[PDB]
Write a protein that binds this ligand. Structure first.
Ligand SMILES: Cc1cc2nc3c(=O)[nH]c(=O)nc-3n(C[C@H](O)[C@H](O)[C@H](O)COP(=O)(O)O)c2cc1C
Ligand SMILES: Cc1cc2nc3c(=O)[nH]c(=O)nc-3n(C[C@H](O)[C@H](O)[C@H](O)COP(=O)(O)O)c2cc1C
Lengths: 121, 121
C-alpha cells in the first residue's frame, strides 16, 4: 500500500511455466523455481491447473482474447497484463508465450515466461 | 528461470539463442543444438554474432524497428519474420524474445525462441 515501501522492496521476480497444448484446459505441467516467490502459489500445487488462477477483476479481457487466439493458432503472445498473488495483491506481468513444436510442427506444449514489472515502459 | 529455462527448452529439442544485453550489439552467447538444424549455421559460427545474419532483402524493416525498440526498453517481442538459412533458403521464423533480468531489474540477457513456421503469409 505505501508508495515508498513498494519501491524500496522492489521485487523484480521472473518465472516460467510449461503447459500441455493437447488438452483444452492448457494445464500447467511444470512451474519453475521462483513461482512461489513471485505469486505465493507453490510450483507443485499449480500442476494440472490453467494459469487463469492468476487473473482477477482488473485483468484486461481483450488481452485474454488475444491469448486464446494465439493458443488456437499455435503462435506466440507478448503482453503486459494485470495478475494477482495468492494474497490478492496485484502485479504487472510481462507475459511471453511461445509454442513448443515437435519435429513435424505439432504444438505439444506452450512455454510462458512471466516477468513482474511496474505499470509502464 | 535462465538455466532451468535453457534446460526446459533443450529437453524438447527447441531452437533458441541467448544474447548478451550488457554487450552493445546483443551478441549471441548461446545457440541451442536446434539452431544448426533450423538455419544451417553451427553454434561456433554464430556465438559472438548478432542474430541479424539470418536476415536478407525480404525481411520486414518495420519488424526490425519493433525489435530494436523492445531491446532498448527491456520488454518482449513476438513476430513472424522472413529469414534465410545459410544456403539461402527463405522461411518464416516465428520469433519470440523475452528479457532475463537480475535483482536490480537490470536486463542481463535476452532469450530468443525460434520456430520455422509454414505460411498464413
Ligand atoms: C504457457 C501459458 C502460460 C500462461 N501464463 C499466464 C500468466 O502468467 N498470467 C495469466 O493471467 N494468464 C496466463 N496464461 C493464459 C491463461 O492460462 C489462459 O490461456 C487465458 O486466460 C485465456 O484463456 P481463457 O479465456 O479460457 O481464460 C498462460 C497460458 C499459457 C498456455
Ligand atoms: C535473443 C535475440 C534473438 C534474436 N533472434 C533473431 C532471429 O532469429 N532472426 C532475426 O532476423 N533477428 C533476430 N534477432 C534480432 C536481431 O538480432 C536484431 O536485434 C534486429 O535485426 C534489430 O537490430 P538492427 O536493426 O540493428 O538489425 C534477435 C535478437 C535477440 C536479442
Amino acid at each position: 500500500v505505501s508508495e515508498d515501501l513498494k519501491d524500496a522492496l522492489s521485487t523484480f521476480q521472473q518465472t516460467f511455466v510449461v503447459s500441455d497444448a493437447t488438452k483444452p484446459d492448457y494445464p500447467i505441467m511444470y512451474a519453475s523455481a521462483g513461482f512461489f516467490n513471485m505469486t505465493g502459489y507453490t510450483s507443485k500445487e499449480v500442476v494440472g491447473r490453467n494459469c487463469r488462477f492468476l487473473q482477477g477483476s482488473g485483468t484486461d479481457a481483450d488481452e485474454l482474447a488475444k491469448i486464446r487466439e494465439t493458443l488456437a493458432a499455435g503462435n506466440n503472445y507478448c503482453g503486459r497484463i494485470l495478475n494477482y498473488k495468492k494474497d490478492g495483491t496485484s502485479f504487472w506481468n510481462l507475459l511471453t508465450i511461445a509454442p513448443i513444436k515437435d519435429e513435424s510442427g505439432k504444438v505439444l506444449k506452450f512455454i510462458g515466461m512471466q516477468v513482474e514489472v511496474s505499470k509502464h515502459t
